[PDB]
Amino acid sequence: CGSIVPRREWRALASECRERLTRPVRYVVVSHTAGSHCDTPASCAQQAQNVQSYHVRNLGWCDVGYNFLIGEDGLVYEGRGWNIKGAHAGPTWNPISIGISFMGNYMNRVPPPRALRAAQNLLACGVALGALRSNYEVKGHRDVQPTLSPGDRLYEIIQTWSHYRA
Amino acid sequence: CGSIVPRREWRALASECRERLTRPVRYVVVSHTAGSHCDTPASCAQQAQNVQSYHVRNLGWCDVGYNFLIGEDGLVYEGRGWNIKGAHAGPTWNPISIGISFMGNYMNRVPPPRALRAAQNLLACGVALGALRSNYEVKGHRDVQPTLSPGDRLYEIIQTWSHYRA
Ligand SMILES: [Cl-]
């Protein structure tokens, strides 16, 4: 499901994280990377590489912090996946959430419809696989942490999603 | 289920097809367009437009002949959809099948894994929706019509699919 781009396909470094999420997960936190935007499979694969590079080598993390990344190419990029706890929303929310991050800065841009489609489809695939609860709740990154993420315009959109709860 | 680029998004001309398929459909016929390939959302949306233009304007069909198109950008493009009979495999197979076409020429190229993923994912959602049978069968275009489509290399791959039946 999701036609998710797997780790090796975007040339990811090997994970070394061990902490597992306890399925089914009840929460989904939507962020933005506040990094560069990308609109092709080649450029978004490079961008997921860059995001992981910063988390791995500079911040010293066991892997890219997000469970999944959404490109403006309309594709979902595998981060830590469904079963591995992320590092994207702080110690309160990391073990009870799935963190999906839109690659870009969305204070003054909206992501394209195909990016939003990929995100909602990804969440449906998480329900189908048992990784998410049927009644999962979507939160903005700014609703759980002091941050402008996921950006004003993207935040406006996710507030209209049927599973969003402030 | 599934993420599909809708007709209006790739700026399709309005369909005038009326004849319906009978759910659930038993057969899926995999073609290639034998035309240009594309690996970005912008270029693949244009390519779906070009394919439809040739079918509608030159061949005089009611819409693009394919039920769905697959781009090398990794996205699925809505053709006639799940419920409308296509024009892709001749009068014997058109009324009993779903026609999916990889946009490109795959005599000497393989489609990228993300294109293959998009096609397999699309068929799974067809089953989930009830548009396809649980036990649908995948055929190559050359298995039902005299043609090189879907191309030697693509044909080699679909023969390895679990629902393939020569
Ligand atoms: Cl970490």
From Swiss-Prot, chains A, B:
Cysteine disulfide partners in this protein: C1-C125, C17-C62, C38-C44
Keyword Oxidoreductase: no
Cell location: Secreted; Cytoplasmic granule
Keywords in alphabetical order: Antibiotic, Antimicrobial, Disulfide bond, Immunity, Innate immunity, Secreted, Signal
Cellular component annotations (GO), alphabetically ordered: extracellular region
One of the GO BP terms on file: peptidoglycan catabolic process
Transmembrane segments: none
InterPro entries named among the record's database cross-references: Amidase/PGRP_sf, Amidase_domain, Peptidoglycan_recognition, PGRP, PGRP_domain_met/bac
PANTHER family membership: PEPTIDOGLYCAN RECOGNITION PROTEIN, PEPTIDOGLYCAN RECOGNITION PROTEIN 1
Family per record: Belongs to the N-acetylmuramoyl-L-alanine amidase 2 family.
Protein task: Innate immunity protein that plays several important functions in antimicrobial and antitumor defense systems. Acts as a pattern receptor that binds to murein peptidoglycans (PGN) of Gram-positive bacteria and thus provides bactericidal activity. Forms an equimolar complex with heat shock protein HSPA1A and induces programmed cell death through apoptosis and necroptosis in tumor cell lines by activating the TNFR1 receptor on the target cell membrane. In addition, acts in complex with the Ca(2+)-binding protein S100A4 as a chemoattractant able to induce lymphocyte movement.
Protein name: Peptidoglycan recognition protein 1
Gene that encodes it: PGLYRP1
